[PDB]
Design a protein around this ligand. Structure first.
Ligand SMILES: [Mg+2]
Ligand SMILES: [Mg+2]
Ligand SMILES: [Mg+2]
Ligand SMILES: [Mg+2]
Ligand SMILES: [Mg+2]
Ligand SMILES: [Mg+2]
Ligand SMILES: [Mg+2]
Ligand SMILES: [Mg+2]
Lengths: 159, 165, 70, 300
RNA sequence: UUCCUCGUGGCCCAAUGGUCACGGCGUCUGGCUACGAACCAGAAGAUUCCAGGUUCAAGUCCUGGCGGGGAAGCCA
RNA sequence: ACAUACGACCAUACCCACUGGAAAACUCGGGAUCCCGUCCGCUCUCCCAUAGAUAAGCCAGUGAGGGCCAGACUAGUAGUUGGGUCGGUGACGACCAGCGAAUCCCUGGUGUUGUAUGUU
RNA sequence: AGGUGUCCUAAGGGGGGCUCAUGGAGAACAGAAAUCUCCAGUAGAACAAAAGGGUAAAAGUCCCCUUGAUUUUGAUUUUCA
RNA sequence: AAAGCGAAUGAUUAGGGACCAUUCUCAAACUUUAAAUAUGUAAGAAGCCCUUGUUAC
């Protein structure tokens, strides 16, 4: 609109939480990123060098280039009627590995273990995840707890 | 054990009105009295009623430690006739007083370096204070190791053999 | 009740007049207020009252509510 | 007219504590984040720090690598370990730092298996020398590289911190280096006085102080250096004492030898520790004490 | 309503952000005169319209309010 | 298990007050020639490790301590997505299919852990 | 509801030491405001200039040294076709 | 959105004890908290495991 520069509307997005501002934990610098990793961008306002625009804050992408203290990220930006490849140079201070990819990577390793174990044992196993299924028949015992009869309560109390 | 009061330091302050020959002379009397090079103090901000400007040299002071600090203190109390108001003792264990006519301390009077007054302030501690001044693992002195007003006045009476009221 | 009935004619819309089950401006039922008063869990401090809790300095609580511990 | 409480309870509620090592005043996280930061295109290549700490009565030298879950100690060397090599006095002087640095450097290469490849400066002469790549059959082999970490110690000319750093470089460990802070370096004229430097290496500066004390104040010499004269080690016996101290480290870096009787295991003092440990009260223990305190003050 | 301008000793006015400040009249004291004017010697007198902000410092620079003045309010 | 050096999470770890701390370590400590830096050997720097001390730092325990952390209640409440030719003059509200908080009072807890070197 | 068409050889760059606004207590002139000392003090100060983020062994303040405010063209981001 | 002010900032009512402990009511340009709806990415053969090869990084 009237003012359309960078950092416009980032009063809360680029700030820091109430009691965790000040010094930046050093575990961020000790994480190691390879090409092909999937990372989440979360701009830290305490470091004003090498930020990413507010559109990419909270987005996720694939690392494509690794340089000294920053990495390149390929992010698909929706621009009206199409998506556009966007290559973002963002410092390792503004990113973190995505746990969704890690959860997938523990699953792909696990699927190999069950398939290897099943083939050696000699029975087939299911690898695909299955959504929640309708409940089967079950019997409920009332030997300890019996049903409690509850009825709607009167308006009674005005306050 | 190690709970003996000592004269941690003694600061002699001379706050003349302005900067110039008068302040330079105040440096000479402080240097002659203490034997150390003094340091000038600049003004925090300008005020019209007081006739001072911002970043203007106003006062001059030295810090004296050790036996030389002890002998200056007794000379000052000699001028005060070994008399101090009980108000002169701060609750943090520190105390101090002020004198006029610095000649009374034994300095030879000379025209050209006229009459100057001084403030004598004494810092009292115990042999454990380094834990708050060292660069590494700086911390705070314990509550029971802190020097109160009642302790320093008792030390002052029993050691300098003076009178406080 | 008649005082509030006259006053509500000066306001737009509908206003209701209701009797509060609480004791005065305190947010306690009349039965509860009597129980706290008998137990000494109340401190008359001006136009209002203060209550006794299980948290805080023991001496301060027992000094402010001497009757609640006798 | 009357001031208010600065603390009250909102100050505590909104108070954000510093990092624990910062509150304890032991770590400089501003310098630590620069010492410990590897280029991202050097994916898994540790940055080794030469940690040099000077406690009272001791010197601690460590080769430390950084990990997400903490720090790893590659090797260590303590000044109190020099007693096996014959260093009984001045365990925290400048020369003891040089020997400890030499001892750590030999231990690192032996752990790496590079002791026969890099030997550095075999005989210390106080010369500004950088550990260069060794020439072997395969060609050049770059020396092991570590960085100095002074912590909160001041980096002034002649400090003992650079004494350990000098001792490590002479051992065979490459350390980024400069002579501006060695003893005998003149700031006005940028030259390094080698004779002054090798004087400090072999405990020389202590010798003239013992010499000057003997001439001027016999009583002060007695008080300061009573242990020296008791063990019959004169001024001229210092530079020779450090001579075989360096040689003994070169030949054997893991010499335990000296011990104080009796030897011991770990378990039975853990039982000793638990015997001296106090325990917190329980809910009913806390509740009972409150009831007792109420009764005492009510009757009072 | 809009735009612009001004507010300083009892009166009328001028003013270089760096000393609460100027000029004339007016007021006060002494002298000359029998006395008063005129005349000659000297003194005192300002919450710089008000409330905020910048700067080390505001009458001066910025905002708002108060009082006053000027200019525009047209085609139907 | 305890101590020390370097740490990780960065208050369950912080702030105030009281009490106690076997071994070792940490610390306070003694001196100012050289290196070094100050108005001042206060800090920093260097030398001593003999003398003295757990007084302080440090650790531990205590406090119906302040705070912090977690739970319960608040509450299926406030709010909100979709629906009706639903109610009401309206402001708004109920219902159908779903999602679903946050205070005040109340209760419990008061660091966990890694590498390396040692400890009676 | 406000701002810009400027200002800075430092108010740019590196390194080191220190902690700020404020409050309490105390010292000759000295008082509500001069300078000195101690204690507390999570930023309530400062960072050229509007406002918003950010910063405490600093990004603030003082000291030391400098000109990376240089050369070569590329890749990427925001407004965007 | 809601909520909060015996929590920071700002606004605000009343009494009480010597500033302190309370009390009523608020915030588009306040906030310790914090939804619903919408929103980014992943759910593999261009993948995974073992041995080994190339390089001037
Ligand atoms: Mg945020
Ligand atoms: Mg920049
Ligand atoms: Mg540093
Ligand atoms: Mg700095
Ligand atoms: Mg709302
Ligand atoms: Mg809330
Ligand atoms: Mg409020
Ligand atoms: Mg989703």
């Amino acid at each position: 609109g009237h003012a359309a520069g960078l950092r416009a509307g980032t009063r809360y997005a680029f700030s820091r939480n109430f009691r965790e501002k000040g010094m930046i934990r050093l575990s961020t610098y000790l994480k190691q990123y390879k090409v092909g990793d999937i990372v989440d961008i979360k701009v830290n306002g305490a470091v004003q060098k090498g930020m990413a625009h507010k559109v990419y804050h909270g987005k996720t992408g694939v690392i494509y280039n690794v340089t000294k203290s920053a990495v390149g990220i390929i992010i698909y930006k929706k621009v009206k009627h199409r998506y556009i490849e966007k290559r973002i140079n963002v410092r390792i201070e503004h990113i973190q590995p995505s746990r969704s990819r890690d959860d997938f990577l523990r699953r792909v390793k696990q699927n190999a273990e069950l398939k290897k174990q099943a083939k050696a044992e000699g029975k087939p196993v299911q690898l695909k995840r299955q959504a929640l299924l309708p409940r089967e028949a079950r019997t409920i015992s009332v030997v300890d707890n019996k049903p409690e009869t509850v009825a709607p309560v009167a308006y009674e109390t005005t306050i | 054990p190690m709970r003996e009061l000592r004269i941690q330091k003694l600061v002699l302050n001379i706050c003349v009105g302005e900067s110039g020959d008068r302040l330079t002379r105040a440096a000479k009397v402080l240097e002659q009295l203490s034997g150390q090079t003094p340091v000038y103090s600049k003004a925090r901000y300008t005020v019209r009623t007081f006739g001072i400007r911002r970043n203007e040299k106003i006062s001059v002071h030295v810090t004296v430690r050790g036996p030389k600090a002890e002998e200056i203190l007794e000379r000052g109390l000699k001028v005060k006739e070994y008399e101090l108001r009980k108000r002169n003792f701060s609750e943090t264990g520190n105390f101090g007083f002020g004198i006029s006519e610095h000649i009374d301390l034994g300095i030879k009077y000379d025209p050209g370096i006229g009459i100057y007054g001084m403030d004598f302030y004494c810092c009292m501690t115990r042999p454990g204070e380094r834990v708050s001044r060292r660069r590494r693992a700086k911390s705070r002195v314990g509550a029971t190791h802190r020097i109160t007003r009642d302790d320093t006045v008792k030390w002052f009476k029993s050691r300098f053999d003076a009178i406080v009221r | 009740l008649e005082a509030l009935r006259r006053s509500q004619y000066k306001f737009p819309g509908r206003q209701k007049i209701i009797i509060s089950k609480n004791w005065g401006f305190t947010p306690l039922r009349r039965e509860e207020y009597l129980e706290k008063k008998a137990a000494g869990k109340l401190l008359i401090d001006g136009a209002y009252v203060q209550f006794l809790g299980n948290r805080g300095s023991l001496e301060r609580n027992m000094k402010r509510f001497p009757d609640a511990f006798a | 007219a009357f001031h208010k409480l600065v603390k009250n309870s909102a100050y505590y509620s909104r108070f954000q504590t510093k990092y624990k090592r910062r509150r304890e005043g032991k770590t400089d996280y501003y310098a630590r984040k620069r010492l410990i930061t590897q280029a991202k295109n050097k994916y898994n290549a540790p940055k080794y720090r030469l940690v040099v700490r000077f406690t009272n009565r001791d010197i601690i030298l460590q080769i430390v690598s950084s990990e997400i879950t903490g720090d790893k100690v590659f090797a260590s060397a303590y000044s109190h370990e020099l007693k096996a090599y014959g260093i009984e006095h001045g365990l925290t002087n400048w020369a003891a730092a040089y020997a400890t640095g030499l001892l750590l450097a030999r231990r690192v290469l032996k752990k790496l298996g590079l002791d026969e490849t890099f030997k550095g400066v075999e005989e210390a002469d106080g010369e500004y020398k950088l550990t260069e790549a060794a020439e072997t059959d395969d060609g050049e082999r770059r020396p092991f590289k570590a960085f100095l970490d002074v912590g909160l110690a001041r980096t002034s000319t002649g400090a003992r911190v650079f004494g350990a750093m000098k001792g490590a470089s002479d051992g065979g460990i490459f350390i980024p280096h400069s002579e501006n802070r060695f003893p005998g370096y003149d700031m006005e004229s940028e030259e390094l006085d080698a004779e002054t430097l090798k004087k400090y290496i072999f405990g020389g500066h202590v010798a003239e102080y013992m010499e000057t004390l003997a001439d001027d104040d016999e009583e002060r010499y007695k008080s300061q250096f009573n242990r020296y004269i008791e063990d019959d080690l004169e001024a001229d016996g210092l530079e020779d004492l450090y001579a075989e101290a360096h040689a003994a480290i070169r030949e054997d870096p893991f010499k335990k030898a000296e011990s104080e009787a009796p030897k011991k295991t770990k378990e039975e003092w853990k039982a000793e520790s638990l015997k001296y440990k106090k325990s917190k009260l329980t809910r009913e223990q806390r509740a009972a004490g409150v009831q007792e305190r109420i009764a005492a003050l009510r009757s009072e």
